[PDB]
Every structure is written in C-alpha cells, then in structure tokens.
CSV table of C-alpha atoms in Angstrom, one decimal:
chain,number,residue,atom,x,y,z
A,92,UNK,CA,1.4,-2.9,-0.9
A,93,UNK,CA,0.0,0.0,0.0
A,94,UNK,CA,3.0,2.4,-1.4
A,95,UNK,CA,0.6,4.3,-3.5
A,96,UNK,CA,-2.7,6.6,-2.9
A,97,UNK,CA,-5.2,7.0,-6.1
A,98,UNK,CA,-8.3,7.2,-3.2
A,99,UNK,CA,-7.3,10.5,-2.2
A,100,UNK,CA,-6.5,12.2,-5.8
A,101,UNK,CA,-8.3,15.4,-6.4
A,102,UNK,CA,-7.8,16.9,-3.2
A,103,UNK,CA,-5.3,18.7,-1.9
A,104,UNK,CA,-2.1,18.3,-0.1
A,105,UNK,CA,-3.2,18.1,3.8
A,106,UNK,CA,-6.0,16.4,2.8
A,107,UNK,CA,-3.7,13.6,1.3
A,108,UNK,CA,-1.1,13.7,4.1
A,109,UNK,CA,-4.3,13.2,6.4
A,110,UNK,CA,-4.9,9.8,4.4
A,111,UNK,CA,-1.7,8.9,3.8
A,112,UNK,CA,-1.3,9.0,7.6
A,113,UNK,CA,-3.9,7.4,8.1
A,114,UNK,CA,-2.9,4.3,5.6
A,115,UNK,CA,0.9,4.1,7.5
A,116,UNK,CA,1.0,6.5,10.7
A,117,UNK,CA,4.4,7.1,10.2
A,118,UNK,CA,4.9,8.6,6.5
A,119,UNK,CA,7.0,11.8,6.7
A,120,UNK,CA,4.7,13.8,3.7
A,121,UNK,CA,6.8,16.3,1.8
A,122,UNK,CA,5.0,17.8,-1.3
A,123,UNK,CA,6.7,18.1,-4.7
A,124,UNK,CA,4.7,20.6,-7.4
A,125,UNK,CA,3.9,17.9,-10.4
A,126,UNK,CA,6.7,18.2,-13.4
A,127,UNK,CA,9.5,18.2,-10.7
A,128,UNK,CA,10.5,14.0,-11.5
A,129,UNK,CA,12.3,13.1,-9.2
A,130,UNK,CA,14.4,9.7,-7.9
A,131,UNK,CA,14.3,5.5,-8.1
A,132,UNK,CA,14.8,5.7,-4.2
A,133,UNK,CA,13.2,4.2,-1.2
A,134,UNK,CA,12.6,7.1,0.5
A,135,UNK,CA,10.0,4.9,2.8
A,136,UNK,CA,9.9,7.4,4.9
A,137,UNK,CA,8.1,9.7,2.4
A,138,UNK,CA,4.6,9.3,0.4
A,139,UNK,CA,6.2,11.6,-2.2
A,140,UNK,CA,3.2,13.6,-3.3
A,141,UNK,CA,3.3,15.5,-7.2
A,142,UNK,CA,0.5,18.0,-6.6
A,143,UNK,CA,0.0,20.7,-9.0
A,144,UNK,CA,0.0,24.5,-8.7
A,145,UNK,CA,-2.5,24.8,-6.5
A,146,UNK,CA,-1.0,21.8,-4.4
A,147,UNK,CA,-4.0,19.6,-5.8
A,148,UNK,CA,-3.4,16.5,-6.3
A,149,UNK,CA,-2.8,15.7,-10.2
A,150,UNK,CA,-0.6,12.7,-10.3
A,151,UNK,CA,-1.5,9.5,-7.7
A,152,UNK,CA,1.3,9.9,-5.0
A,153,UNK,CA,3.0,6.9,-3.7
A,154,UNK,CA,5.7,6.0,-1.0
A,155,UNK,CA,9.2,4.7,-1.4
C-alpha cells in the first residue's frame, strides 16, 4: 502494498497527508509541485506527493 494513494486524488495536499497517515502513521509527507521528477529511491519514509500549482493532487502519490 500500500505504497501508493489514487483514493485521495483530487484533493489537496493536507487532505492527502491526512490519508496517507492514516494508511501508515508514520509517513513523513513532503510535497513536490507535479513536473519536478524526481528519484528511483526508497525514501519509505516519504509518500512523495506531485501535486499541481494549487497543491491539488494531479498525479497519484505513492511512497518509497
């Protein structure tokens, strides 16, 4: 698994970490503005979240 959060697309940021939180209590949420690719890590400690410009969110998000 449960690396990855389609349930919560649409909404913003918070909104998401809420979930995301919810799904594994201990995901440290930064945001990343959708466009900015990124890494092949396993930044586990992340649900790495491409939002848009009004930190909506535009791609599904996913861990590490």
């Amino acid at each position: 698994l449960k690396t990855e959060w389609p349930e919560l697309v649409g909404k913003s940021v918070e909104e998401a970490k809420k979930v995301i939180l919810q799904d594994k209590p201990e995901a440290q949420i930064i945001v990343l503005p959708v466009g900015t690719i990124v890494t092949m890590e396993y930044r586990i400690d992340r649900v790495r979240l491409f939002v848009d410009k009004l930190d909506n969110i535009a791609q599904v998000p996913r861990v590490g």
